[PDB]
Amino acid sequence: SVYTTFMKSHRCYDLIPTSSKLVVFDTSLQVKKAFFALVTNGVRAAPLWDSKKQSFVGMLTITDFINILHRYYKSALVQIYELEEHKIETWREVYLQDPLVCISPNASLFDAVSSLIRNKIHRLPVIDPESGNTLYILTHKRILKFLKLFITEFPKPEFMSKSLEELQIGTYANIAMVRTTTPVYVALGIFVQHRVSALPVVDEKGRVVDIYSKFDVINLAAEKTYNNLDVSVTKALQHRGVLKCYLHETLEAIINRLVEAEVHRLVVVDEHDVVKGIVSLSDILQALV
Amino acid sequence: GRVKIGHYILGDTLGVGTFGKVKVGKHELTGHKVAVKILNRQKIRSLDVVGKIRREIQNLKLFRHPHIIKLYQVISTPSDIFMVMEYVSGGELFDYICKNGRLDEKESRRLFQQILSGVDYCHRHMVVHRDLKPENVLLDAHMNAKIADFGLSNMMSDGEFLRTSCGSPNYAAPEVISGRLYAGPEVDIWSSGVILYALLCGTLPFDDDHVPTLFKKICDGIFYTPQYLNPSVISLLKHMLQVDPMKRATIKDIREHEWFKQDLPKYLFPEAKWHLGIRSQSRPNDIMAEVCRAIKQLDYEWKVVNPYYLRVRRKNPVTSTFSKMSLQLYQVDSRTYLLDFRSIDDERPGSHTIEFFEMCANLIKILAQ
Amino acid sequence: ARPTVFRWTGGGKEVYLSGSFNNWSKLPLTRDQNNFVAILDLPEGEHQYKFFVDGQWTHDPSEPIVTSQLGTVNNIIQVKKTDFEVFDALMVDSQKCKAPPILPPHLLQVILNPALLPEPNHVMLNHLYALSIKDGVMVLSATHRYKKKYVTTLLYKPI
Ligand SMILES: OCC1(c2ccc(-c3cc4nc(O[C@@H]5CO[C@H]6[C@@H]5OC[C@H]6O)[nH]c4cc3Cl)cc2)CC1
Ligand SMILES: Nc1ncnc2c1ncn2[C@@H]1O[C@H](COP(=O)(O)OP(=O)(O)O)[C@@H](O)[C@H]1O
Ligand SMILES: Nc1ncnc2c1ncn2[C@@H]1O[C@H](COP(=O)(O)O)[C@@H](O)[C@H]1O
Ligand SMILES: Nc1ncnc2c1ncn2[C@@H]1O[C@H](COP(=O)(O)O)[C@@H](O)[C@H]1O
Ligand SMILES: [Cl-]
Ligand SMILES: [Cl-]
Ligand SMILES: [Cl-]
């Protein structure tokens, strides 16, 4: 593979921006304050510092919110005590009862892509070993953006010309979906038992109307509405056009589509606009490594 | 009966710079001419410029700009240090403006571009040549500007300001004459501003035999613009000779100016409220007394450099790695003061930046405002 | 050999340098002002020299002397290895030898007030900036540089 050689050569540092912002939480910080700080800072992931251990113990992401929110939701008439009064350490001790993954800026973008899939994670902290400081959080979206800048300037191979059906890339079976009527608590249930980024919203018939993502869950913390999870998936999405691909659309064309609108995953819809499959940024980078 | 160094016959003393004698040098066989900066070792060690000379050589050896005098080679002897440099026949730009008048808009601009380009090259290499005057701008056979004498120059370090109130009063910045702290590039801009004036007018913008009125006029940023001066350059000079360093033009802002950009040659250039530290209102001595009482109540070894500057180090309980930081007290107003916490970059561990935060957060949770 | 400098500081009509290095032959020194010089190459090691300043044989008192077993007082010079390389010589030379400042306005200028921030002035790097303690939690910040890229780390720590 010619794209795999491009990655195995380029340093992680090159992908790091000119001037980044990094939010680090002490593990002693109350978990609600943590999720609010993510929202206020406009960041989707935060390294966690155990002052007692004097090292970065892990990452706090929207999945942590999804997990507390579903493990502990009693009803809309009674407070999620655990979410309110609990430290990041108190909740991590529960959730992770039964380690930290990181790339060095000296490591190659391929090592980074491998490490992402190898551990099945979306957020990878780039840490300089000399300093021990976390520099940046390498995402799929960013790697895919950089690989797209070169894919365009460099020639088009056989795979790029081939379709998504022919090349056979992504998940097209056991597709976890929510419906219009489905409440947020149930959608959160799916996110836990299935471990997938977004849930396509379907009408009376199996046609995709919207797509409820792990990101739209960040909004509950933003609007301070997480106390009412009984609300439907559609009601929850009223705070903010759908993007779908066809099985006969080129892999290079869909690669430009995912990067052009800067989306995390494309839905494989058939001629009658019904959900037939799914293709994520994670799968695209895997297929290319 | 010829006195040689390298293979050059030492000749007439061209001048005496900040630290040494400068003499001409004519190559034994080729006739090539150099400017030889002689520095007596015994004399340089008599002042404490031994480190300053080390850095000066270091910088000048790694530079190569068409408007900065080239340092060819340094020849050490037991006696003295000889700095073989490029020689320009034209001499001082200052003397040029004396003999001939002021330069025409077009000719002035040319030279101003050349100078600034070099001033930029220095800054682009963390060097701030303070003492930038037409007396230090040399000219070659083909009338090209050549920045010379880095005696008073200094390095720019991440997080630190310079103090030295160096250079002539006429070309000096108001903050420099005021002896305040400064970043570095801004004072070179002020100097470059008076050079542009000197080029277009043939006189100095800030000048007086009554030195008190000289400094008043410098600090009031007030100068005379002759009727012959083009508004576009008066605009540039007004933006360059700002008494406020924060309101002053950058090499970036100048590169963007309409008068500058005009006929500018290709080769010359490439291409929720946060608070700084804590602010105690108490007596400056009593405030630093509290940071000592506190630095001790936290059990951290320090070093008192100034009666307002400290160089503290705390042992990591886990990693066992010694981490360093610096504290400085600054006067914000007449009634209020501020304690500035700066990280000291050392030389596998935990995390330098986070450790620095936890270090600070302690000396704060036991301190004023 | 290494270039050694011989300089007679003082007045004179005719000034010569006799030395071990030239079999004590009178070498004329060229004068600039009150400094008569010669730059001769000498091997690393001990050398003895004297001056013939206007009909009188002398030595530079400011320089190291040696008195002979015969009562000959000549100047001496140990030309050391470290004298030839500039950075070795400047290293050996380095070894041989209020009111509170007014706050620079550069420090009051920030990059903080999505993830992408403006390039900061080098002077504010490594400085501590903190946000007011709202709800028993202090927020700390600082911009550091790693190679040619910059990172502004925010620590959320309860107090
Ligand atoms: O061209 C005339 C001519 C000629 C060439 C050169 C020198 C000469 C002068 C020196 N003055 C010295 O030191 C004094 C003290 O410290 C001060 C100052 O100069 C350096 C500065 O730091 N070291 C010197 C070395 C030499 Cl070779 C003299 C005459 C051939 C006869
Ligand atoms: N590098 C990492 N080291 C340790 N835990 C991690 C790391 N990255 C993510 N996690 C954990 O994995 C879980 C799922 O995270 P993730 O898939 O990255 O979510 P998101 O799609 O919002 O980025 C979370 O509970 C988070 O704490
Ligand atoms: N709704 C979904 N149902 C089933 N699999 C999915 C769904 N969304 C994404 N996937 C797959 O889950 C894996 C990880 O995806 P992602 O979390 O989107 O990065 C990939 O193999 C996707 O194809
Ligand atoms: N296929 C899609 N079409 C349209 N919007 C989408 C799609 N997938 C995700 N989004 C939107 O993108 C956000 C989710 O962000 P993220 O998980 O970072 O990709 C939400 O606002 C979704 O509505
Ligand atoms: Cl002079
Ligand atoms: Cl010339
Ligand atoms: Cl003049």
PDB file of N, CA, C and O in Angstrom, chain B residues 324-359:
ATOM      1  N   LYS B 324      12.013  23.325  38.662  1.00  0.00           N
ATOM      2  CA  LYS B 324      12.260  24.721  39.031  1.00  0.00           C
ATOM      3  C   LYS B 324      11.250  25.720  38.457  1.00  0.00           C
ATOM      4  O   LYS B 324      10.626  25.450  37.426  1.00  0.00           O
ATOM      5  N   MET B 325      11.099  26.881  39.154  1.00  0.00           N
ATOM      6  CA  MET B 325      10.236  28.025  38.809  1.00  0.00           C
ATOM      7  C   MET B 325      10.786  29.338  39.406  1.00  0.00           C
ATOM      8  O   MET B 325      11.567  29.294  40.362  1.00  0.00           O
ATOM      9  N   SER B 326      10.395  30.496  38.831  1.00  0.00           N
ATOM     10  CA  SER B 326      10.847  31.819  39.287  1.00  0.00           C
ATOM     11  C   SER B 326       9.699  32.780  39.630  1.00  0.00           C
ATOM     12  O   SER B 326       8.690  32.846  38.922  1.00  0.00           O
ATOM     13  N   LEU B 327       9.883  33.532  40.718  1.00  0.00           N
ATOM     14  CA  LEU B 327       8.915  34.505  41.208  1.00  0.00           C
ATOM     15  C   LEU B 327       9.475  35.907  41.100  1.00  0.00           C
ATOM     16  O   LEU B 327      10.635  36.130  41.447  1.00  0.00           O
ATOM     17  N   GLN B 328       8.653  36.851  40.629  1.00  0.00           N
ATOM     18  CA  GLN B 328       9.031  38.256  40.501  1.00  0.00           C
ATOM     19  C   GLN B 328       7.872  39.142  40.950  1.00  0.00           C
ATOM     20  O   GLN B 328       6.724  38.865  40.604  1.00  0.00           O
ATOM     21  N   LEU B 329       8.166  40.186  41.746  1.00  0.00           N
ATOM     22  CA  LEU B 329       7.148  41.144  42.176  1.00  0.00           C
ATOM     23  C   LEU B 329       7.243  42.346  41.229  1.00  0.00           C
ATOM     24  O   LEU B 329       8.348  42.792  40.901  1.00  0.00           O
ATOM     25  N   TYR B 330       6.095  42.795  40.717  1.00  0.00           N
ATOM     26  CA  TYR B 330       6.016  43.912  39.785  1.00  0.00           C
ATOM     27  C   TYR B 330       5.044  44.966  40.324  1.00  0.00           C
ATOM     28  O   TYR B 330       4.014  44.592  40.884  1.00  0.00           O
ATOM     29  N   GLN B 331       5.346  46.273  40.125  1.00  0.00           N
ATOM     30  CA  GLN B 331       4.463  47.375  40.519  1.00  0.00           C
ATOM     31  C   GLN B 331       3.497  47.638  39.363  1.00  0.00           C
ATOM     32  O   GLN B 331       3.930  47.967  38.259  1.00  0.00           O
ATOM     33  N   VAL B 332       2.200  47.395  39.596  1.00  0.00           N
ATOM     34  CA  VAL B 332       1.130  47.576  38.596  1.00  0.00           C
ATOM     35  C   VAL B 332       0.692  49.041  38.586  1.00  0.00           C
ATOM     36  O   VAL B 332       0.499  49.632  37.520  1.00  0.00           O
ATOM     37  N   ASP B 333       0.495  49.594  39.790  1.00  0.00           N
ATOM     38  CA  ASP B 333       0.078  50.959  40.065  1.00  0.00           C
ATOM     39  C   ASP B 333       0.891  51.442  41.284  1.00  0.00           C
ATOM     40  O   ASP B 333       1.862  50.786  41.689  1.00  0.00           O
ATOM     41  N   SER B 334       0.526  52.615  41.817  1.00  0.00           N
ATOM     42  CA  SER B 334       1.102  53.252  43.000  1.00  0.00           C
ATOM     43  C   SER B 334       0.580  52.542  44.258  1.00  0.00           C
ATOM     44  O   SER B 334       1.324  52.381  45.230  1.00  0.00           O
ATOM     45  N   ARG B 335      -0.697  52.099  44.207  1.00  0.00           N
ATOM     46  CA  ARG B 335      -1.417  51.421  45.281  1.00  0.00           C
ATOM     47  C   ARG B 335      -1.395  49.887  45.197  1.00  0.00           C
ATOM     48  O   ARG B 335      -1.649  49.240  46.218  1.00  0.00           O
ATOM     49  N   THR B 336      -1.115  49.297  44.006  1.00  0.00           N
ATOM     50  CA  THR B 336      -1.145  47.835  43.874  1.00  0.00           C
ATOM     51  C   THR B 336       0.117  47.224  43.214  1.00  0.00           C
ATOM     52  O   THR B 336       0.777  47.877  42.407  1.00  0.00           O
ATOM     53  N   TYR B 337       0.422  45.950  43.588  1.00  0.00           N
ATOM     54  CA  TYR B 337       1.561  45.113  43.156  1.00  0.00           C
ATOM     55  C   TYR B 337       1.095  43.729  42.641  1.00  0.00           C
ATOM     56  O   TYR B 337      -0.049  43.356  42.894  1.00  0.00           O
ATOM     57  N   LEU B 338       1.972  42.975  41.924  1.00  0.00           N
ATOM     58  CA  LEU B 338       1.641  41.663  41.338  1.00  0.00           C
ATOM     59  C   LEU B 338       2.790  40.675  41.460  1.00  0.00           C
ATOM     60  O   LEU B 338       3.934  41.035  41.178  1.00  0.00           O
ATOM     61  N   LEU B 339       2.477  39.413  41.796  1.00  0.00           N
ATOM     62  CA  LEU B 339       3.485  38.360  41.881  1.00  0.00           C
ATOM     63  C   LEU B 339       3.422  37.485  40.640  1.00  0.00           C
ATOM     64  O   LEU B 339       2.424  36.799  40.418  1.00  0.00           O
ATOM     65  N   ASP B 340       4.488  37.522  39.833  1.00  0.00           N
ATOM     66  CA  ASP B 340       4.595  36.772  38.587  1.00  0.00           C
ATOM     67  C   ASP B 340       5.332  35.449  38.749  1.00  0.00           C
ATOM     68  O   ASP B 340       6.482  35.411  39.195  1.00  0.00           O
ATOM     69  N   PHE B 341       4.649  34.367  38.353  1.00  0.00           N
ATOM     70  CA  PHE B 341       5.146  32.997  38.410  1.00  0.00           C
ATOM     71  C   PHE B 341       5.593  32.589  37.006  1.00  0.00           C
ATOM     72  O   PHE B 341       4.763  32.545  36.093  1.00  0.00           O
ATOM     73  N   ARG B 342       6.898  32.306  36.831  1.00  0.00           N
ATOM     74  CA  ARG B 342       7.464  31.889  35.549  1.00  0.00           C
ATOM     75  C   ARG B 342       8.096  30.488  35.652  1.00  0.00           C
ATOM     76  O   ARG B 342       8.762  30.183  36.636  1.00  0.00           O
ATOM     77  N   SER B 343       7.859  29.636  34.651  1.00  0.00           N
ATOM     78  CA  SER B 343       8.383  28.276  34.606  1.00  0.00           C
ATOM     79  C   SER B 343       9.820  28.260  34.126  1.00  0.00           C
ATOM     80  O   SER B 343      10.168  28.946  33.157  1.00  0.00           O
ATOM     81  N   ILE B 344      10.647  27.451  34.798  1.00  0.00           N
ATOM     82  CA  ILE B 344      12.060  27.278  34.473  1.00  0.00           C
ATOM     83  C   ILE B 344      12.261  25.906  33.833  1.00  0.00           C
ATOM     84  O   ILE B 344      12.159  24.869  34.505  1.00  0.00           O
ATOM     85  N   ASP B 345      12.503  25.918  32.512  1.00  0.00           N
ATOM     86  CA  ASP B 345      12.714  24.734  31.683  1.00  0.00           C
ATOM     87  C   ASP B 345      14.022  24.006  32.075  1.00  0.00           C
ATOM     88  O   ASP B 345      15.114  24.559  31.899  1.00  0.00           O
ATOM     89  N   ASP B 346      13.892  22.772  32.618  1.00  0.00           N
ATOM     90  CA  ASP B 346      15.003  21.932  33.104  1.00  0.00           C
ATOM     91  C   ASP B 346      15.894  21.315  31.993  1.00  0.00           C
ATOM     92  O   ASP B 346      15.466  21.224  30.836  1.00  0.00           O
ATOM     93  N   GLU B 347      17.142  20.903  32.371  1.00  0.00           N
ATOM     94  CA  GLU B 347      18.176  20.259  31.541  1.00  0.00           C
ATOM     95  C   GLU B 347      18.321  20.834  30.127  1.00  0.00           C
ATOM     96  O   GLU B 347      18.294  22.047  29.940  1.00  0.00           O
ATOM     97  N   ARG B 348      10.122   9.966  30.388  1.00  0.00           N
ATOM     98  CA  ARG B 348      10.774   9.581  31.638  1.00  0.00           C
ATOM     99  C   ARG B 348      10.108  10.191  32.918  1.00  0.00           C
ATOM    100  O   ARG B 348       9.882   9.422  33.858  1.00  0.00           O
ATOM    101  N   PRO B 349       9.754  11.507  33.014  1.00  0.00           N
ATOM    102  CA  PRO B 349       9.147  11.997  34.270  1.00  0.00           C
ATOM    103  C   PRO B 349       7.606  11.881  34.314  1.00  0.00           C
ATOM    104  O   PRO B 349       7.054  10.891  33.838  1.00  0.00           O
ATOM    105  N   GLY B 350       6.944  12.876  34.915  1.00  0.00           N
ATOM    106  CA  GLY B 350       5.494  13.001  35.025  1.00  0.00           C
ATOM    107  C   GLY B 350       4.973  13.942  33.955  1.00  0.00           C
ATOM    108  O   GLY B 350       4.614  13.483  32.869  1.00  0.00           O
ATOM    109  N   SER B 351       4.946  15.267  34.244  1.00  0.00           N
ATOM    110  CA  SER B 351       4.549  16.359  33.330  1.00  0.00           C
ATOM    111  C   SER B 351       4.974  17.720  33.879  1.00  0.00           C
ATOM    112  O   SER B 351       4.370  18.239  34.822  1.00  0.00           O
ATOM    113  N   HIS B 352       6.016  18.290  33.276  1.00  0.00           N
ATOM    114  CA  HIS B 352       6.611  19.569  33.640  1.00  0.00           C
ATOM    115  C   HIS B 352       5.562  20.645  33.876  1.00  0.00           C
ATOM    116  O   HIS B 352       5.444  21.132  35.001  1.00  0.00           O
ATOM    117  N   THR B 353       4.769  20.966  32.833  1.00  0.00           N
ATOM    118  CA  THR B 353       3.733  22.001  32.845  1.00  0.00           C
ATOM    119  C   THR B 353       2.748  21.813  34.008  1.00  0.00           C
ATOM    120  O   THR B 353       2.517  22.777  34.739  1.00  0.00           O
ATOM    121  N   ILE B 354       2.203  20.582  34.200  1.00  0.00           N
ATOM    122  CA  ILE B 354       1.232  20.292  35.276  1.00  0.00           C
ATOM    123  C   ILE B 354       1.884  20.397  36.634  1.00  0.00           C
ATOM    124  O   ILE B 354       1.268  20.917  37.563  1.00  0.00           O
ATOM    125  N   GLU B 355       3.140  19.952  36.737  1.00  0.00           N
ATOM    126  CA  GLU B 355       3.902  20.047  37.975  1.00  0.00           C
ATOM    127  C   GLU B 355       4.100  21.521  38.356  1.00  0.00           C
ATOM    128  O   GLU B 355       3.923  21.882  39.522  1.00  0.00           O
ATOM    129  N   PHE B 356       4.384  22.377  37.350  1.00  0.00           N
ATOM    130  CA  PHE B 356       4.541  23.818  37.536  1.00  0.00           C
ATOM    131  C   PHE B 356       3.245  24.414  38.077  1.00  0.00           C
ATOM    132  O   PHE B 356       3.295  25.237  38.985  1.00  0.00           O
ATOM    133  N   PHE B 357       2.091  23.970  37.551  1.00  0.00           N
ATOM    134  CA  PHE B 357       0.793  24.449  38.016  1.00  0.00           C
ATOM    135  C   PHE B 357       0.576  24.077  39.479  1.00  0.00           C
ATOM    136  O   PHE B 357       0.313  24.961  40.297  1.00  0.00           O
ATOM    137  N   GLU B 358       0.745  22.780  39.812  1.00  0.00           N
ATOM    138  CA  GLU B 358       0.570  22.287  41.178  1.00  0.00           C
ATOM    139  C   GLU B 358       1.548  22.998  42.138  1.00  0.00           C
ATOM    140  O   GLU B 358       1.157  23.335  43.257  1.00  0.00           O
ATOM    141  N   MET B 359       2.762  23.329  41.660  1.00  0.00           N
ATOM    142  CA  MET B 359       3.755  24.061  42.441  1.00  0.00           C
ATOM    143  C   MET B 359       3.187  25.430  42.849  1.00  0.00           C
ATOM    144  O   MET B 359       3.117  25.737  44.039  1.00  0.00           O
TER     145      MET B 359
END
